């Protein structure tokens, strides 16, 4: 009850910044997450015993893949934390409760393959879920874990508040399907510019939380250059293993997933920052001004990839 989580001083100060890296000590990630729940939501939000039990079962259901692993889950939750703490009054009590959980759960049981690889392999998940295949799975694993004995962290909520939080979590997790991001971001841009954006309209909030989800999920591009550059190694280790798996099905992979195009990485990062990342954090900053440091950091990393191309890096 009287039991704060505290972090060493450097982590206490730096966890509040958008560019914070959660570090290589796996055993501290649970405490970092509880710390973020306790400050962004409250000591009262969840029973400590249930939360801890929930975090450890969530961790167990992330696999030992190079990028889509437990570190990625906690990284994506910390970016959400920083967004929430910089936009104190913009969010409901339920949203505060739902979104850090959504972020921790958003890639549950990821195998290191894209929706498109499951569809070409003809994985059973692709017949259960014909679009957003992996994301419907992640939401289904979230509900499974919420239903284990002693794991219902939302038990203090009314039946209808419980339904609303599971509904914030579902939409937040589905939104991490980047195929959906392009259209979400365009509609948000149009709505912001024609002044129709209305945060009291639930379908508008949903879109804005969707974009937050993309922003957190891509937050590898918003770190200190050394973190950005080394995370890209992990990202490509997955993509290229998928490439190999595509060639085993007799399919030339897209160049993103072809290890033979190693040498083009700097230029692939450029297109990605111009086509995906910069537009994401640009539109996010328009809607939520205090998130501008994510845009500044993204722009800084774009400029570092340009240096790599010019032979200065």
Ligand X SMILES: Cc1nc2c(NC(C)C)nc(CCc3nc(N4CCCC4)nn3C)nn2c1C
The binding site for 3',5'-cyclic GMP consists of 68, 269
Please check whether residue 204 is in contact with residue 197, taking contact to mean a CB–CB distance below 8 angstroms: yes
Which of residues 136 and 152 has its CB atom nearest to Mg ion in the complex?
136
Task: Tell me the window of 52-60, 152-160, 203-211, 212-220 that interacts with Zn ion (CB under 5 A).
Answer: 212-220
Which of residues 197 and 277 has its CB atom nearest to Mg ion in the complex?
277
How far apart are the C-alpha atoms of 29 and 22, rounded to whole Å?
A: 7
* Helix (H/G/I), strand (E/B), else coil: 32: helix
Which of residues 50 and 171 has its CB atom nearest to Mg ion in the complex?
171
Interacting residue with Zn ion among 217, 238, 242, 258 (CB under 5 A): 217
**Which residue positions form the known binding site for 3',5'-cyclic AMP?**
68, 269
- How far is Cα of residue 6 from the mean position of the Cα atoms in its chain? 24
Task: Tell me the window of 132-140, 161-169, 262-270, 304-312 that interacts with ligand X (CB under 6 A).
Answer: 262-270
**The tokens of 182 are what?**
């392009």
Q: Does 218 bind ligand X (CB under 6 A)?
A: yes
Interacting residue with ligand X among 220, 283, 285, 291 (CB under 6 A): 220
Catalytic residue among 68, 110, 137, 138: 68
Which of residues 165 and 256 has its CB atom nearest to ligand X in the complex?
256
Task: Tell me the window of 10-18, 56-64, 167-175, 215-223 that interacts with ligand X (CB under 6 A).
Answer: 215-223
Which of residues 206 and 264 has its CB atom nearest to ligand X in the complex?
264
Question: Using CB under 6 A, which residues numbered 170 to 189 contact ligand X?
Answer: 178
Q: Does 264 bind ligand X (CB under 6 A)?
A: yes
Closest CA to 184 of 203, 205, 210: 210
Q: Is 88 a catalytic residue?
A: no
Angle between helices 202-217 and 278-287 (to 10 degrees): 140
Select from ligand X, Mg ion, Zn ion, none the partner in contact with residue 178, using the beta carbon and a kind-dependent cut-off of 5 to 8 Å.
ligand X
Burial class (CB in 10 A: 0-12, 13-18, 19+), 190: exposed
Interacting residue with Mg ion among 176, 214, 269, 283 (CB under 5 A): 176
Question: Using CB under 5 A, which residues numbered 103 to 122 contact Mg ion?
Answer: 107
**The tokens of 98 are what?**
């739902």
Please check whether residue 83 is in contact with residue 134, taking contact to mean a CB–CB distance below 8 angstroms: no
Interacting residue with ligand X among 80, 232, 288, 294 (CB under 6 A): 232
In this structure, the number of other CB atoms found within 10 A of the CB of residue 311 comes to: 6
The values of phi and psi at residue 26, to 5°, are -50, -45
Interacting residue with Zn ion among 107, 177, 238, 242 (CB under 5 A): 107
Please check whether residue 168 is in contact with residue 95, taking contact to mean a CB–CB distance below 8 angstroms: yes
How distant, in Å, are the alpha carbons of 1, 190, 192, 299 from that of 104? 24, 30, 29, 26
Q: Which long-range contacts (CB under 8 A, 24 or more apart) does 242-248 make?
A: 242/112, 242/113, 242/114, 242/117, 245/113, 245/117, 245/121, 246/117, 246/120
Residues at the contact surface with Mg ion, assessed by CB under 5 A: 107, 176
Q: Give catalytic residue positions.
A: 68
The residues binding ligand X (CB under 6 A) are 178, 218, 220-221, 232, 235, 255-256, 261, 264-265, 268, 271-272
């Amino acid at each position: 009850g009287l039991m704060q989580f505290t972090l060493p001083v450097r982590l206490c100060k730096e966890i509040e910044l958008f560019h914070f890296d959660i570090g290589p000590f796996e055993n501290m990630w649970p405490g970092i997450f509880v710390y973020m729940v306790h400050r962004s939501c409250g000591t009262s939000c969840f029973e400590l015993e249930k939360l801890c039990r929930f975090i450890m079962s969530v961790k167990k259901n992330y696999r030992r893949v190079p990028y889509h692993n437990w570190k990625h889950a906690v990284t994506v939750a910390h970016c959400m934390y920083a967004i929430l703490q910089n936009n104190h009054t913009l969010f409901t009590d339920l949203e505060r409760k739902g979104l850090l959980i959504a972020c921790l759960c958003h890639d549950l049981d990821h195998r290191g393959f894209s929706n498109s690889y499951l569809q070409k392999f003809d994985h059973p998940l692709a017949a259960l879920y014909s679009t957003s295949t992996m994301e419907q799975h992640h939401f289904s694993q979230t509900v499974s874990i919420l239903q284990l004995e002693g794991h219902n962290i939302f038990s203090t909520l009314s039946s209808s508040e419980y339904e609303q939080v599971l509904e914030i979590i579902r939409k937040a997790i589905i939104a991490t399907d980047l195929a959906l991001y392009f259209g979400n971001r365009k509609q948000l841009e149009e709505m912001y510019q024609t002044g129709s954006l209305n945060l009291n309209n639930q379908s508008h909030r949903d879109r804005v939380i969707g974009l937050m989800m993309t922003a957190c999920d891509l937050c590898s591009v918003t770190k200190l250059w050394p973190v950005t550059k080394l995370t890209a190694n992990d990202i490509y280790a997955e993509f290229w293993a998928e490439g190999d798996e595509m060639k085993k099905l007799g399919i030339q992979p897209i160049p993103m997933m072809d290890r033979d195009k190693k040498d083009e990485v700097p230029q692939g990062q450029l297109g990605f920052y111009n086509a995906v990342a910069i537009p994401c954090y640009t539109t996010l900053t328009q809607i939520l001004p205090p998130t501008e440091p994510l845009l500044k950091a993204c722009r800084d990393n774009l400029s570092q990839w340009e240096k790599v191309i010019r032979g200065e890096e």
